[PDB]
Amino acid sequence: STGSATTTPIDSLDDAYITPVQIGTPAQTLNLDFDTGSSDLWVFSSETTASEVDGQTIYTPSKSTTAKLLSGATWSISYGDGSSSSGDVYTDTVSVGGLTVTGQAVESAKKVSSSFTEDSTIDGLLGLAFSTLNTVSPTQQKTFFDNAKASLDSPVFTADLGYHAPGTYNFGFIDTTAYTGSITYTAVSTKQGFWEWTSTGYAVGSGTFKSTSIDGIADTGTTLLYLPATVVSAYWAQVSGAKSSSSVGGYVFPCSATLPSFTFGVGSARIVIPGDYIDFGPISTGSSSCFGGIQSSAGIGINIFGDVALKAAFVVFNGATTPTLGFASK
Numbered sequence: 329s330t331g332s333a334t335t336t337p338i339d340s341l342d343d344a345y346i347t348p349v350q351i352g353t354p355a356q357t358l359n360l361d362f363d364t365g366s367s368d369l370w371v372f373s374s375e376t377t378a379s380e381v382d383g384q385t386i387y388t389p390s391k392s393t394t395a396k397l398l399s400g401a402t403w404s405i406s407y408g409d410g411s412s413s414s415g416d417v418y419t420d421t422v423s424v425g426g427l428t429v430t431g432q433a434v435e436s437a438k439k440v441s442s443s444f445t446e447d448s449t450i451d452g453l454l455g456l457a458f459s460t461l462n463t464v465s466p467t468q469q470k471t472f473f474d475n476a477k478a479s480l481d482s483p484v485f486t487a488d489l490g491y492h493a494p495g496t497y498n499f500g501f502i503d504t505t506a507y508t509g510s511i512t513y514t515a516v517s518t519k520q521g522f523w524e525w526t527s528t529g530y531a532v533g534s535g536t537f538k539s540t541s542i543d544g545i546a547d548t549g550t551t552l553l554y555l556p557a558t559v560v561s562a563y564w565a566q567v568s569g570a571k572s573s574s575s576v577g578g579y580v581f582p583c584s585a586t587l588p589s590f591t592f593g594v595g596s597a598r599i600v601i602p603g604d605y606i607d608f609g610p611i612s613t614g615s616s617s618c619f620g621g622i623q624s625s626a627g628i629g630i631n632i633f634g635d636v637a638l639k640a641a642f643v644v645f646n647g648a649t650t651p652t653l654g655f656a657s658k
């Protein structure tokens with residue numbers, strides 16, 4: 329089996345991407361944030377505290393003939409931005425792009441934090457990290473990918489995120505028409521439950537490539553690229569007037585600037601992020617200060633190759649017995 333679904337930016341900045349997912353019988357279609365940095369499939373639901381729902385589409389398990397309460401199971405998660413959600417669990421049929429899993433754990437939110445309520449466009453998350461991070465208690469549950477894997481033609485999924493445009497998540501096959509050149513594969517550590525790998529270095533604009541090992545995670549759920557402070561300082565030093573603002577929460581730059589590209593290494597290969605991809609627009613409406621797309625990971629504890637980096641590539645999440653990651657230009 330295979331599946332293929334289009335993923336669409338939620339706004340003009342690519343702050344996140346949503347992918348339609350069919351849950352239950354008859355299908356209830358919810359738009360979920362596919363997140364390779366977490367491992368819970370959770371949804372706004374008929375059980376979500378009413379004051380915490382504001383425009384999202386909800387899953388109603390009582391209207392699904394295939395929904396079953398997973399008795400006694402609860403979940404609770406916090407994310408890297410400080411947001412959180414929690415609730416109980418059903419099993420139901422879940423389909424993505426024509427690929428169907430029966431008995432998938434669908435985590436129904438009873439509570440969500442304010443950032444979720446305030447974003448009408450995201451109806452939940454679909455985690456694609458390793459199932460060891462799944463928060464369901466007392467019986468940990470498997471991700472959609474983990475459940476589908478043995479049925480897939482090949483035990484892989486791919487992320488092809490667009491810059492200010494839709495893109496694609498594929499399951500079970502590698503679309504050889506979706507990238508240029510060859511895919512470079514690189515080793516993954518699953519020790520922390522993430523798609524964790526080591527970049528071989530970086531360049532700023534047309535500058536020389538600096539060979540240096542940068543350990544980080546491929547995280548489709550994260551908007552920005554978070555790298556060591558040394559690397560990030562070297563990037564922003566090439567932008568006149570750029571500075572790190574503690575009041576804003578990171579590097580900002582004059583909206584009149586032309587941003588340089590940023591290159592990261594994958595083995596002996598190179599992925600080039602165009603400067604435009606690093607522009608996240610005015611810090612507040614009408615401001616001439618713009619928020620940067622490359623930020624320091626200091627204080628996070630891990631480097632994060634988020635959407636800014638991943639959207640510059642065709643990315644293979646290879647879930648074979650020894651997982652690996654592949655990157656191609658496109």
Ligand SMILES: Cc1c(C=O)c(-c2nnc3c4c(C[n+]5cc6c(C)n(C)c(C)c6c(Cl)n5)n(C)c(C)c4cnn23)c(C)n1C
Pocket residue numbers: 338343344361365407408409410411447450547549550551552628632
């Ligand atoms: C350590 C870490 C992160 C790790 O991942 C992280 C981050 N970065 N984007 C996202 C997240 C997103 C994606 N996302 C980002 C958004 C931004 C920048 N804006 C303005 C809006 C309206 C957004 C929405 Cl709705 N969605 N979502 C949905 C969740 C649950 C996230 C959690 N963390 N997150 C931050 C800010 N930090 C410090």
